[PDB]
């Protein structure tokens, strides 16, 4: 069974990444909003000696033009390329969008309000 405290200590190493005020303040705001449940994100795996920085995923998403733009254009390949998969490419694309949707879709919309969950379905419906 996967222990919950294991995901908890993984969040502490995220803050230890750097004492930069921008990164520290960002984590306090993002985790605090989703803190409604009280637990961190979905999971935080460890890459060799590096930790999967959530900040990197968000910065890459905006660097593209918006999560909805990425879904409708299906530019998940660009983010997957940065997150080099081992060699099995499991639900790599699917795994990224679901965890983001679980606690980062409201946060992204709150910070920029790129679009509404209504038109998002139009973007998701086209993919299907």
SS3 content of the chain, % helix, strand, coil (to 5): 65, 5, 30
Rounded distance between C-alpha atoms, residue 30 and residue 26, angstroms: 6
Method: NMR
Those residues whose C-beta lies under 8 Å from the C-beta of residue 52, and which sit 6 or more positions away, are: 44, 45, 46, 83
Rounded distance between C-alpha atoms, residue 62 and residue 35, angstroms: 23
Instruction: Extract the tokens encoding 117.
Output: 């969950």
Rounded distance between C-alpha atoms, residue 118 and residue 59, angstroms: 24
Sign of CA dihedral 23, 24, 25, 30: positive
Domain of residue 117: give its range. 1-128
Given the structure tokens 């299906």, which residue do they identify? 74
Which of the 8 DSSP states describes residue 44? -
Whole-angstrom distance between the N-terminal and C-terminal Cα of the chain?
34
Those residues whose C-beta lies under 8 Å from the C-beta of residue 17, and which sit 6 or more positions away, are: 23, 51, 53
CATH of the domain at 71: 1.10.150.60
In the chain, the number of structural domains is 1
């Amino acid at each position: 069974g996967w222990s919950f405290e294991e995901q908890f200590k993984q969040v502490r190493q995220l803050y230890e990444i750097n004492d930069d005020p921008k990164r520290k303040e960002f984590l306090d705001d993002l985790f605090s909003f989703m803190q409604k449940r009280g637990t961190p994100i979905n999971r935080l795996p460890i890459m060799a000696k590096s930790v999967l920085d959530l900040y990197e995923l968000y910065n890459l998403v905006i660097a593209r033009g918006g999560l909805v733009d990425v879904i409708n254009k299906k530019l998940w390949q660009e983010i997957i390329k940065g997150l080099h998969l081992p060699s099995s490419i499991t639900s790599a694309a699917f795994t990224l969008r679901t965890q983001y949707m679980k606690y980062l879709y409201p946060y992204e919309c709150e910070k920029k309000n790129l679009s509404t969950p209504a038109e998002l379905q139009a973007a998701i419906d086209g993919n299907r």
